[PDB]
Design a binder for these strands. Structure first.
Lengths: 699, 225, 62, 23, 717, 81, 232
RNA sequence: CACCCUCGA
């Protein structure tokens, strides 16, 4: 889906499989966190479905030894002195010593400030211990978390549930047309993007000799040349668009290991899984009611949340019993208007926009005479190939960008019995729509319930309308205070700040690095996990936020601002928390998840409608839903569901006929599946018989 | 305590931003007039924009042209920022032909009589030695935002590339009111409207369009039944 | 036996059904649901099921 | 500064603890 | 109403659209009509509207736990590709909007359309069939908006002032319209207390009597009220003629109002009134200033001054363990009790520190959603966290989510968090299995008769009289008295009967008995219905959803099974106790019972326990053998003292539980009889569901217990 | 004593449950009468003994079920249990 | 620019002085843009006349009870505040109301000076008891909207004069709501619904026409700048 | 269609 998803996948630890255990053979004890996972397996990133606890992500600094165990680094403490000597310990090796937490106060020389320090001890025992007892200590605060989990700002303020959802949904982010790095970051974005491998890094230092949208040629210092080719509009495994764009320009000095071109969800080498959106935290006329999201049509007009998706369509021409299927533009009983977009071969031409049902590859298959309906044979007499053309499935629509043809006649090695094979690539530019799923990094998820015009949105004092409205009620229950903090800092990053340096450094910013006392608008900041911005420093920064171009400070020290209702004009009675939040577009879009069926294919054995959207199947009226009908007493609706609407071979056809005739619905018959049941009970030497009121067995 | 008629005066901040003061207004009325004028300005101001483009070496959006740094998708995004005005009220074609090396900006476009580009310095593409760019741009006149016209709905063939049209020439509108709440017989609101445009039209022209819009619209109430 | 074989222990129920040569009186919600008859409940009971509606003699001119 | 090794954008960190070993 | 996409309806109604396209001559034949629909020619969109007109559809969201998990709606063609759902039905579907999906089904037959229009329409299913309390009501943002405008602010602008000095009474308005104009200018606040002349709202029955009384208040009659403009705006939403309510609209108050409206007023009135409340609630929740900010999450001011105490009591035990004075296993319980008091004292320090302007307090105190314990973890302290073992960790989570957890604090929170998710999945599995078992055991329990005529009922403890004379409401009135029908005439000290037989004990009808002094009723029960196959309507009682006597043919068995299985999702005794009860197992407690009424023989020692009973009348001594690890239940001895620990000499009756635990129902049957074992099962299961905050009416449980005792064994052929 | 019923809520379900004994019986009444009305609209151009047409005045393009449901509300039908 | 045709205004009469107006269909989202403006213009920008202050004989510092009448001072002020009146004279005008003996005081018992006109002579004011006497002077002014009595603190002389809230607006209560209507294919167009309840001084049609005229002039101030383009 | 994987409320 996006580079982070692939990286995490390659760093997975799965408990299932041969030699391990079966899913039915995994109690509540194999799945919960174990005290030895510290610094080795993340306790957060794990699915919440039936595979919870069985699939983990390797910790950041963890490695694997030749034996197979997972080692993690620790700083050796000599005599109450922190040393830069780093040694990797296994689980049992770690238990034989005692380690101090990463965020212990340390002297500039290495001596611990406090005599007592937090220490982890054998058997997963946490307690304070004297400074003269610490043998090792943790390397970094984020030592215990995964790559994705380390990508959550203010992670220390989010509960493990919403944090799990945030880390798991970051892997569901959709690559946008254009990518924007987040204002509020963590530091992990860079290395995540680079080590993911979906960018283009220079192997050896040099200068850019010639750069194009197609490739980038680097002239090294020694004299050699290396050319990196950009992957453009490539279909990902999940339909997302993997598109690389050069960053450097012609004649640019580039060092070794520098990002010269970044791909999907990347900006100057950092993971850009979403966009920075101006957020207001307020209820709005019920359109954002519990977890629904309201968005500004700006995001539609300016393609802020637009994404590219590519589908692969495939068809083959085989040898049949009565001849061979041929791919031809000449299709029986097809107008010249539908075939207007096809080339001479029956293939759609590049650039043509195709709706659902349109022909992409015209293939006809010869059908024998002994397979014709009596009405079909008469219609053939009263007026030998049938239509098997490749049509666009329901719900698909885009520009045809690529075609690939393989012909047995032309040396192309196809499976025995195939003469030709055509693959058509269709690309769709999906704008954000009502019902698409967005989410933040703190398990704060929601669908789009309404996209209002830019003028309807509550706008700030200077006229800038907000971009996204989140309901307030679904905030304090989930215990994801992160977003709140993230919101505040977000604004401080957009506007910048200037701390009063005169009369000394204020008492709150004494611990802030000198690089933070001044920040320009659209500044990039990092809030490392379990370190980073503390609530006090954030309070101060809100106190010293930069003014706008007119010289006015829009948000208060509390972080709230006065908004105007764009529909009525009256300002909202109370100040509202306003900021910038990083929102991602998740891969759960109505364009894919919408489905409906009148009729369609039926399973041959059970004669019940197929399942799944891809097979044009129907929804399953399960057992519980039958209980619902019975509870309502809707007897006729239940019979209808289980007979004429399902597997009544004659009943469903008579229903179709009665609908197109305007007549009434006929009487349901017997389900074919029950006939199958009787035959199956007979196959087990059980004589099942249906008796009438008189007693005679009926056939 | 009887009507005086309200007066409107204009104050110029920059070449494309003006403040309007309307006074005196009935108490409570200022915010409503600010919002009504703002809503009409942000959505119903006539402007011109590019309807479609056509590049010779390309057939759809998801490709690249040899010799240019930006792909077609980035070219279209950079072209979405193009500000243009048109006098024709009918489709009109602009042309762009440029050979590399160098940088292609909005000034390299040749506009037919009636249309005009207001920011010739906008970056469009970077051309290397092997770069050549030939582009036709169909510009129409409209208002608001209309999505890219489909080729199935239009009579356009395959070589035509439709683009989203952001017709609105206004950029940012806000307002503030100063209320005179001196506990006496004379209370009154003074409205300060702030209109910023994109050099496509002057703020006064945008406000005039909105004023004509609302005068015509509110005329419906005057006719009896 | 059809309402029991569809609950739990399908084989254990069908064996006893065949030994006892049990006959299923097709008069139960689960059973009629299986075979597609109207459930003997709600609008399926005989009081509401067999009903004829006839308009009162009052009628329009045409 | 944050991640000063490849030539990345200068992302400023609220970091109080130094990183002895890079990822 | 529900809103479905155009592309969904087009496919769903494909044959209907083909028919009408070939009728209106948009297509030559039905075949070309099919081609037109498949190519989506513009003619269909105008034609489709005629087809879907008043044609209901069914919306379903899995899991379909109860019958309100499927409801009928009138479809509305909407652009886009998402289904538009009404905000009030979300509770029934338990449907949030974070990616939830719903299935649509199109009823085809005329009978199917009628069943959907009448039985399954969302407006005809406002009440929960399990408890009778409304579901389609203001629930989250709506209740917050209403709690906002129905709040009395003492110092708000425009407040009523008494006549003093040179100015008369300030803040007395002649019409609510005048108050609206005053609020428009900015003089009056919507929450200020004022005096308003009302002319289109019935005054309270308290004041209507003294002001009018002789004749009911008439639409047009004027009267002065000491309310706020917001409360008046609220009282215009509920129907005309409802007594004006000058309360602050908490969620409980709104539920009470809508319940009274459902009891008195017809269905459609409630259906429309709740929509009006929805509109108002959203409008004012938008303008209620409800917002979350880091500043509004106020930490206790003395937080460190509160925390070091409990860290220090934790330190206490370490040397009473260092010198060996405390066992390592007792230390843990000691420290647990140390920090558990911490969280309570911190809660008290939090309630007073939080102002009422705080939006979190406006969210929680208005009954919208959430508890104050969540606010303690959020603003106070997370507290002691549990490891996957089960016992509380002797070390707490001192930090709050506002302060920022330490590395190890987060890692140690994760054990409990992940095991929470895991055992939640497992709990849901077991709950669903129990549900299907309950469904199959009672699937054929239908209301087949009107009245079985049986005197058999059961005695319900309506209330308990205190020694001073005051009557205490029994906590089980809601689940055991409501929706019942009488089985014995209600008699007070006088000969007047308060409620006749067979009158559904409604709310005012219960107030009748309670104000009459009678404290016990005999109500008809489905247990006592003596019908060959089905059950009678009189013994079943009121249909919790319909509000009236159940109609003949309603599958009350499935309704009971679903009503019991739906709340099984939230449990800890526990759910395995529910299984022990429904499966007639030999319980864990295995408490003995008195086989014969008589004198107790406490023969307690330390090696073992043996207790005998001397029959009060005849009989012989009955001996038992129990382990000393159990404990005697404080039986309400004949001395009238409930705290009478069972010692020798007490006069216990037959079938009296001796030691604490859970008595074996199998023996209760062969001791006291089927009636008493049924009652035992009912209230023993109800203890489990009530000790968790779940209100299931005893009716549904009785429907199942009735099926557990339908068979008898054969001693001699 | 209530706001105007709009759309599918008309006729009011409360008045409909007065001419009938229970929710379940009304369903059959309405549906079988709707079948009669549909047969009327399908046998108007051919044949005699056609089932009784819409008793009340039908709205333009009104569903047969709605017409039958209004007839039930106007006390224009009988029954036979 | 071009056209946006078929917006129609229809009126539904509920009472003789209350009407609903539907403007349909409007381009998205003009219904919201103009609805609030029209409501505020109706409630605040329609010329009317109303009572500014009064003075009851026998009340100087108590403002509590008047001997001989059932209603106390505040209730008297309330029933006098609902009195509907129109005036052609811009300056304040003084009316008198005097009635002695038992009986009922009505709005018809008022003596209007030349220039003013009372439109509800039948409004009940007070019930006069046996030997009861009520004399009150009424100051009538011309204005618009609703101005509170506190600003009228100066209109009461320090000699029994009591200022009252002035309901100058001839309209009493206005509400509005907007729904969605699909003219051709899109369902974005807006349908505006105004609900106006006024006094018998003017009909809803004339009130809405007055608000429309005022608003047309108001936005004509913006139209007079350059004059460019917008449809009809 | 048999199993398999990953995922969503």
């Amino acid at each position: 889906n996006n580079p982070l998803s692939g990286l995490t996948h390659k760093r997975r630890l799965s408990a299932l499989g041969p030699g391990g255990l079966s899913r039915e053979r995994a109690g509540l004890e194999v799945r919960d966190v174990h005290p030895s996972h510290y610094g080795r397996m993340c306790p957060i990133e794990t699915p919440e479905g039936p595979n919870i606890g069985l699939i983990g992500s390797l910790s950041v600094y963890a490695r694997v030894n030749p034996f197979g165990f997972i080692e993690t680094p620790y700083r050796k403490v000599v005599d109450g002195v922190v040393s830069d000597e780093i040694v990797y310990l296994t689980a049992d090796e770690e238990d034989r010593h005692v380690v101090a937490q990463a965020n212990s106060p340390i002297d500039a020389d290495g001596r611990f400030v406090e005599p007592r320090v937090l220490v982890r001890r054998k058997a997963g025992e946490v307690e304070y211990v004297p400074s003269s007892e610490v043998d090792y200590m943790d390397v970094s605060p984020r030592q215990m978390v995964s790559v994705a989990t380390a990508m959550i700002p203010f992670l220390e303020h989010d509960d493990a549930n919403r944090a799990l959802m945030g880390a798991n949904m970051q892997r569901q982010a959709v690559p946008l047309v254009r990518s924007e790095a987040p204002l509020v970051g963590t530091g992990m974005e860079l290395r995540a993007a680079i080590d993911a491998g979906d960018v283009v890094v220079a192997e050896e230092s040099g200068v850019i000799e010639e750069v194009s949208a197609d490739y980038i040629t680097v002239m090294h210092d020694n004299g050699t040349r290396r050319t990196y080719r950009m992957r453009k509009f490539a279909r990902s495994n999940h339909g997302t668009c993997a598109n690389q764009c050069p960053i450097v320009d012609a004649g640019d000095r580039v060092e070794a290991g520098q990002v010269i071109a970044d791909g999907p969800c990347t900006d100057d080498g950092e993971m850009a899984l979403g966009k920075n959106l101006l957020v207001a935290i307020m209820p709005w006329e019920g359109h954002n009611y519990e977890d629904a999201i309201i968005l500004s049509n700006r995001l539609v007009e300016e393609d802020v949340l637009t994404s590219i998706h590519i589908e692969e369509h495939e068809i083959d021409a085989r040898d049949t019993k009565l001849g061979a299927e041929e791919i031809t533009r000449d299709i029986p009983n097809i107008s010249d208007e539908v075939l207007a977009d096809l080339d001479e071969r029956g293939i759609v031409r590049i650039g043509a926009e195709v709706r659902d049902g349109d022909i992409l590859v015209g293939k006809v298959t010869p059908k024998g005479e002994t397979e014709l309906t009596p009405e079909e044979r008469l219609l053939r007499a009263i007026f030998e190939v049938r239509d098997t053309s490749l049509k666009v499935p329901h719900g698909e629509s885009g520009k045809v960008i690529g075609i690939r043809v393989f012909s047995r006649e032309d040396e192309d090695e196809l499976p025995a019995g195939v003469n030709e094979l055509v693959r058509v690539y269709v690309a769709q530019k999906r704008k954000i729509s009502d019902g698409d799923k967005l989410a933040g990094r703190h398990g704060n998820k929601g669908v789009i319930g309404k996209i209002l015009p830019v003028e309807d949105m509550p706008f700030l004092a200077d006229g800038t309308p907000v971009d996204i409205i989140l309901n307030t009620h679904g905030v304090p229950r989930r215990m994801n205070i992160g977003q709140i903090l993230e919101t505040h800092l977000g604004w401080c990053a957009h506007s910048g700040w200037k701390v009063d340096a005169a009369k000394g450094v204020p008492d709150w910013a004494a611990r802030l690095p000198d690089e933070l006392l001044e920040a320009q608008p659209n500044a990039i900041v990092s809030t490392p996990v379990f370190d980073g911005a503390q609530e006090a420093e954030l309070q101060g920064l809100l106190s010293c936020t930069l003014p706008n171009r007119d010289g006015d400070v829009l948000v208060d020290a509390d972080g709230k601002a006065m908004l105007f209702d764009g529909r009525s004009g009256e300002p909202f009675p109370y100040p509202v928390t306003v900021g910038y939040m990083y929102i991602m577009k998740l891969h759960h879009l109505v364009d894919d998840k919408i489905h409906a069926r009148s009729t369609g294919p039926y399973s041959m054995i059970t004669q019940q409608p197929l399942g799944g959207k891809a097979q044009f199947g129907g929804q399953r009226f399960g057992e519980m839903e039958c209980w619902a009908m019975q509870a309502y007493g809707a007897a006729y609706t239940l019979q209808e569901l289980l007979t004429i609407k399902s597997d009544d071979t004659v009943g469903r056809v008579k229903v179709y006929e009665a609908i197109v005739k305007g007549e009434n619905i006929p009487e349901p018959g017997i389900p074919e599946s029950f006939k199958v049941l009787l035959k199956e009970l007979q196959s087990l030497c059980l004589n099942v018989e249906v008796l009438s009121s008189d007693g005679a067995a009926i056939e | 305590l009887i009507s005086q008629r309200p007066t409107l005066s204009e104050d110029v901040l920059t070449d494309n931003r003006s403040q309007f003061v309307i006074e005196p207004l009935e108490p409570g009325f200022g915010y409503t007039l600010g919002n009504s004028l703002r809503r009409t300005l942000l959505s119903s101001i006539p402007g011109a924009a590019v309807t479609s483009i056509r590049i010779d070496g390309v057939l759809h959006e998801f490709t690249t042209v040899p010799g240019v740094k930006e792909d077609v998708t980035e070219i279209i995004l950079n072209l979405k920022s193009l500000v243009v005005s048109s006098e024709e009220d009918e489709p009109v074609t602009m042309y762009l032909r440029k050979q590399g090396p160098g940088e292609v900006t909005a000034g390299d476009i040749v506009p037919p009589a009636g249309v005009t580009v207001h920011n010739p310095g906008m970056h469009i593409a970077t051309l290397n030695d092997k770069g050549k760019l030939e582009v036709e741009l169909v510009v129409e006149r409209g208002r608001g935002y209309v999505p890219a016209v489909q080729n199935r709905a239009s009579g356009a063939e395959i070589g035509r590339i439709p683009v989203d049209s952001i017709y609105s020439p206004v950029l940012k509108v806000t307002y503030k009111v100063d209320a005179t709440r001196v506990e006496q017989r004379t209370d009154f609101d003074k409205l300060i409207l702030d209109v910023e445009t994109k050099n496509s039209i002057s703020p006064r022209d945008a406000l005039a369009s909105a004023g004509k819009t609302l005068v015509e619209l509110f005329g419906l109430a005057r006719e009896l039944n | 036996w059809l309402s029991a074989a569809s609950f739990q222990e399908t084989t254990r129920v069908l064996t006893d059904a065949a030994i006892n040569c049990r006959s299923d009186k097709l008069n139960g919600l689960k059973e009629n649901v299986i075979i597609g008859k109207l459930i003997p409940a709600g609008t399926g009971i005989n009081r509401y099921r067999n009903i004829a509606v006839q308009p009162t003699e009052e009628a329009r001119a045409a | 500064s944050n991640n000063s090794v490849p030539g990345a954008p200068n992302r400023v960190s609220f970091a109080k603890l130094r990183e002895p070993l890079e990822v | 109403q529900c809103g479905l996409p155009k592309l969904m309806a087009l496919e769903l109604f494909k044959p209907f659209v083909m028919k009408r396209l070939v009728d209106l001559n948009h297509a030559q034949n039905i075949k070309s009509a099919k081609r037109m629909v498949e190519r989506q020619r513009p003619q269909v969109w105008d034609v489709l509207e005629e087809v879907i007109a008043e044609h209901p559809v069914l919306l379903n969201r899995a899991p379909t736990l109860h019958r309100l998990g499927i409801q009928a709606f009138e479809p509305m063609l909407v652009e886009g590709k998402a289904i538009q759902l009404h905000p009030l039905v979300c509770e029934a579907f338990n449907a949030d909007f974070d990616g939830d999906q719903m299935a649509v089904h199109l009823p085809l037959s005329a009978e199917a359309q009628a069943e959907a229009r009448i039985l399954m329409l969302s407006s005809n299913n406002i009440l929960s069939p399990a408890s009778g309390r409304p579901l389609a009501m203001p629930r989250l943002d709506m209740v917050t908006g209403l709690y906002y405008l129905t709040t009395e602010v003492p110092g708000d602008t425009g407040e009523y002032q008494p006549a003093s000095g040179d100015h008369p009474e300030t803040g007395v308005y002649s019409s609510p319209a005048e108050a609206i104009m005053a609020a428009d200018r900015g003089v009056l606040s919507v929450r200020a207390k004022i005096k308003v002349r009302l002319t289109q709202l019935r005054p309270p029955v308290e004041i209507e009597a003294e002001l009018f009384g002789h004749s009911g208040w008439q639409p047009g009659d004027a009267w002065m009220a000491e309310t706020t403009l917001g409360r008046v705006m609220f009282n215009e939403l509920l129907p005309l003629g409802y007594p004006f309510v000058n309360k602050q609209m908490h969620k409980k108050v709104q539920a009470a109002i809508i319940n009274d409206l459902a009891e008195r007023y017809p269905m459609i009135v409630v259906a429309q009134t709740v929509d009006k409340l929805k509109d108002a609630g959203f409008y004012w929740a938008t303008r209620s200033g409800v917002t979350v900010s880091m500043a509004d999450v106020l930490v206790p001011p003395r937080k460190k001054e509160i925390l070091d105490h409990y860290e220090e009591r934790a330190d206490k035990v370490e040397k009473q363990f260092q010198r060996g004075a405390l066992n390592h296993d007792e230390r843990n319980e000691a420290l647990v009790e140390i920090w558990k008091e911490a969280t309570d004292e911190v809660g008290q320090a939090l309630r007073e520190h939080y102002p009422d302007d705080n939006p979190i307090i406006t969210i929680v105190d208005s009954g919208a959603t959430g508890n104050f314990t969540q606010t303690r973890t959020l603003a106070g302290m997370k507290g002691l966290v549990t490891n996957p073992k089960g016992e509380f960790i002797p070390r707490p989570v001192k930090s709050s989510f506002r302060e920022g957890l330490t590395v190890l604090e987060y890692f140690i929170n994760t054990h409990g968090a992940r095991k929470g998710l895991a055992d939640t999945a497992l709990r849901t599995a077991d709950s669903g299995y129990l549900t299907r078992r309950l469904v199959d055991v009672s699937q054929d329990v239908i209301v087949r008769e009107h009245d079985c005529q049986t005197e058999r009922g059961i005695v319900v403890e309506l209330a308990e009289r205190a020694p001073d004379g005051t009557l205490i409401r029994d906590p089980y009135i809601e689940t055991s008295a409501y929706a019942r029908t009488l089985g014995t005439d209600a008699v007070d000290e006088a000969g007047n009967v308060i409620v006749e037989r067979g009158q559904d004990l409604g709310d005012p009808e219960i107030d009748a008995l309670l104000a009459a002094g009678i404290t016990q009723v005999k109500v008809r029960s489905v247990l006592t219905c003596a019908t060959s196959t089905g059950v009678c309507a009189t013994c079943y009682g009121r249909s919790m959803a319909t509000g009236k006597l159940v109609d003949i043919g309603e599958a009350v068995g499935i309704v009971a099974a679903q009503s019991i299985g739906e709340p099984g999702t939230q449990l800890t005794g526990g759910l395995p106790r529910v299984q022990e009860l429904f499966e007639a197992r030999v319980p864990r407690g295995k408490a003995p019972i008195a086989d014969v009424t008589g004198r107790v023989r406490l023969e307690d020692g330390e090696r073992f326990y043996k207790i005998t009973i001397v029959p009060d009348d005849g009989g012989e001594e009955v001996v038992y053998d129990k382990i000393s690890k159990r404990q005697r239940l404080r039986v309400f001895k004949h001395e009238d003292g409930s705290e009478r620990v069972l010692s020798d000499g007490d006069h216990v009756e037959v079938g009296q539980q001796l030691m604490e635990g859970s008595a074996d129902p199998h023996e209760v049957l062969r001791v006291q009889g089927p009636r008493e074992v049924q009652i035992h099962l009912v209230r023993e299961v109800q203890e489990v569901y009530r000790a968790q905050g779940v209100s299931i009416h005893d009716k549904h449980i009785e429907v199942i217990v009735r099926q557990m005792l339908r068979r008898v064994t054969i001693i001699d052929s | 004593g209530y706001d105007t019923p709009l759309g599918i809520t008309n006729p009011p379900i409360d008045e409909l449950l007065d001419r009938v004994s229970s929710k379940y019986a009304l369903v059959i009444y309405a549906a079988k009468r709707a079948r009669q009305i549909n047969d009327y609209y399908n046998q108007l151009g051919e044949g005699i003994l056609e089932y009784v047409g819409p008793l009340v005045e039908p709205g333009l393009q009104e569903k047969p079920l709605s017409i039958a449901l209004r007839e039930i509300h106007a006390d224009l039908l009988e029954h036979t249990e």
